[PDB]
């Protein structure tokens, strides 16, 4: 580790005075596989990023617009609804969360949602 810096600084001195969607440890595509939502390909082509709200894996290039770097924090996939809620940026996250939880207790609602769909679907309004 012989560097010349000490000798030069002495020579010039002044006089002064006195998890599952990743490659294995050895490196292998885990099986069974989970694929990107846009291309249906695994982590072998490119690393996959996992949305932390829904189980949708994505590729950094398969997005629109593509991500330039890895998202360090919690990332939101483009397949959710809070994006249209983000159109109005004045309101804080607590009101948004309470609005979402207004529909978080009857999550199925399948009969009523198909019913509302056909109710709107009628071309001539009632």
């Amino acid at each position: 580790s012989g560097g010349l810096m000490e000798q030069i600084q002495a020579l010039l001195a002044p006089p002064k005075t006195d998890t599952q969607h990743e490659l294995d440890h050895n490196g292998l595509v885990p099986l069974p596989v989970k694929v990107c939502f846009t291309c249906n390909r695994s982590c072998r082509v490119a690393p996959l990023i996992q949305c932390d709200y829904c189980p949708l894996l994505f590729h950094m290039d398969c997005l629109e617009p593509p991500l330039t770097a890895m998202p360090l924090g919690r990332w939101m996939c483009p397949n959710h609804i809070e994006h249209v809620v983000l159109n109005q940026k004045n309101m804080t996250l607590s009101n948004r969360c309470q609005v979402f939880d207004r529909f978080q207790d009857t999550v199925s609602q399948h009969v009523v949602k198909v019913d509302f769909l056909n109710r709107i679907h009628k071309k001539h309004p009632p």
């Binding site: 002044p14 005075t17 050895n26 292998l28 249906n40 397949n79 609804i81 249209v84 509302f116």
Partner: protein, 536 residues
């Protein structure tokens, strides 16, 4: 009606999950509460159904302080903007006043081990070391020149005026700092007294300062000559290794990437992806191969065969009968499979071992071709550069090292093959082999760093390809079926013989019913051979 039920059936089938489907239902319900317009509704549903044109068309028919950007914040309105005295009309009308960006990081960050090799850091340290000495030397020399100029000016005027000459804190130069910096460096703590003497009485004080500066300049110059001698052969030992960013990673990554389990996984994953696509019913034809590789030269083929034969002929555990058998397999059967003995294809049904051998052989051939192309490019670039630099008037358009001759440049590739043979025999050390490769092919040399092991791997496959009755039965079945012409043939006659080909596949299924079965197609086109492998 039932059409809506069928639509919802196919959408929850295609989404393959309940959470994404429920998000879609939340979207349509939020629409149903009259908070969403039709165009906004389709722009929200586009992420879910952007890859099914049929589903999207069906859904369309069924329907019938402020912040901007990502890094700019608005300044407070009641914020005392710092006054400026030079603001002209263009300054007021043009300059930004309301938005600010906040720098999030700092330069000279933790980048020491982020992406750089250990041999770039030595070069950086040597460069810095050079710069510190050079900057001190050039400050001293500039001060010497300034004092020489002021002394020459002083010596030309009347003696009764010399005692009336004085100097300011620029000390005759154009800078108020640099000359004082040099004098401070020379004199340590006694610098202010010398500076006052130079400013007050230049006539008597200039020559002694000049003498001291000159003596220090000579001593520093000889020390720098010694340091220049030492700094060399560190650039030489570090330069080529600094540009090769992959060797350390590549050696281990390749020593793993060639294992049988890794090769098997590389195709099993693709098979699983295609199976999932078929399950989701996406528009993908059920005849495409899972993996595709290209052979672009026959000369590379016989070169690789010669290398493998060279290694196998020097084996102690392989008997003369097995040597002959491997010779027939390598120089006769394989070229026949590649049709060395358009739109002409060959069909082959193989087990795991033949798939491994084909993968390894393709890897070796591709690397040999890469080295060959690099050598050709180097020779062409050298010839073009010589032709260009011969015709140069340079500035009229208003030691070193001796580069190799053209003959060495065209003999690089046979020398590379001889080097590979020497490494395989064990006569040359891996370190010297790697160094010669790096000096021969610069940053494309790593491609050949782990060739011998690769060859070794291939050899093992060949040996097993003789000892396992399954493999010889496979090649015999291929030969017997080709005698009928069903396995492989002209592209047009496929539909003529297709049923017969089916029979062949059937036999494969009843010969390896406990083992993976691979369909391999060798398609010839324009001098290249495309090997397409698919797992059954």
């Amino acid at each position: 009606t039932l059409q809506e039920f069928s639509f919802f059936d196919k959408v929850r089938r295609v989404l393959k999950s309940q959470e994404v489907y429920e998000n879609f239902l939340r979207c349509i319900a939020l629409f149903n509460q009259e908070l969403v317009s039709g165009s906004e509704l389709l722009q929200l549903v586009s992420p879910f159904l952007g890859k099914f044109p049929e589903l999207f068309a069906q859904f369309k028919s069924f329907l019938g302080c402020k912040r901007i950007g990502s890094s700019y914040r608005a300044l407070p309105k009641t914020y005392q903007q710092p006054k400026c005295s030079g603001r002209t009309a263009i300054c007021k009308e043009v300059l930004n006043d309301t938005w600010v960006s906040f720098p999030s990081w700092s330069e000279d960050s933790t980048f020491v081990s982020s992406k750089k090799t250990p041999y770039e850091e030595q070069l950086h340290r040597c460069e810095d070391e050079r710069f510190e000495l050079d900057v001190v030397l050039e400050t001293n020399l500039a001060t010497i020149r300034v004092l020489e100029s002021v002394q020459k000016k002083l010596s030309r005027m009347a003696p009764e005026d010399q005692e009336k000459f004085r100097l300011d804190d620029s000390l005759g130069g154009t800078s108020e700092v640099i000359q004082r910096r040099a004098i401070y460096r020379i004199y340590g703590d006694k610098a202010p007294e010398i500076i006052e003497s130079l400013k007050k009485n230049p006539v008597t004080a200039v020559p002694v300062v000049l003498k001291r500066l000159k003596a220090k300049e000579e001593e520093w110059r000889e020390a720098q000559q010694g340091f220049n001698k030492i700094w060399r052969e560190q650039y030489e030992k570090a330069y080529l290794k600094s540009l090769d960013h992959q060797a350390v990673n590549f050696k281990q990554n390749d020593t793993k990437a060639l294992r049988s389990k890794s090769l098997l996984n590389e195709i099993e994953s693709v098979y699983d992806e295609h199976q999932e696509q078929h399950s989701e019913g996406r528009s993908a034809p059920s005849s495409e191969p899972h993996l595709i590789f290209v052979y672009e030269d026959r000369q590379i083929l016989e070169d690789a065969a010669a290398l493998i034969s060279y290694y196998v002929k020097r084996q102690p555990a392989i008997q003369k009968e097995d040597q002959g058998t491997i010779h027939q397999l390598l120089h006769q059967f394989v070229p026949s499979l590649f049709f060395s003995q358009d739109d002409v294809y060959s069909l082959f049904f193989a087990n795991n071992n033949w798939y491994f051998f084909l993968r390894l052989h393709q890897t070796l051939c591709s690397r040999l071709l890469k080295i060959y192309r690099q050598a050709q490019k180097q020779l062409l670039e050298y010839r073009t550069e010589k032709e260009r630099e011969k015709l140069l008037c340079e500035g009229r358009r208003e030691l070193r090292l001796k580069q190799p001759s053209e003959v060495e440049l065209e003999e690089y590739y046979p020398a590379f093959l001889d080097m590979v043979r020497s490494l395989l025999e064990g006569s040359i050390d891996p370190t010297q082999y790697e160094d010669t490769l790096r000096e021969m092919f610069t940053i494309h040399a790593y491609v050949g760093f782990t060739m011998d092991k690769l060859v070794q791997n291939i050899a093992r496959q060949l040996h097993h390809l003789v000892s396992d009755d399954v493999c010889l039965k496979v090649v015999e079945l291929y030969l017997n079926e080709k005698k009928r012409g069903a396995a492989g043939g002209n592209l047009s006659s496929r539909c003529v013989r297709a049923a017969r080909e089916t029979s062949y596949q059937w036999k494969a299924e009843r010969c390896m019913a406990d083992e993976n079965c691979f369909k391999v197609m060798f398609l010839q086109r324009k001098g290249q051979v495309i090997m397409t492998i698919e797992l059954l």
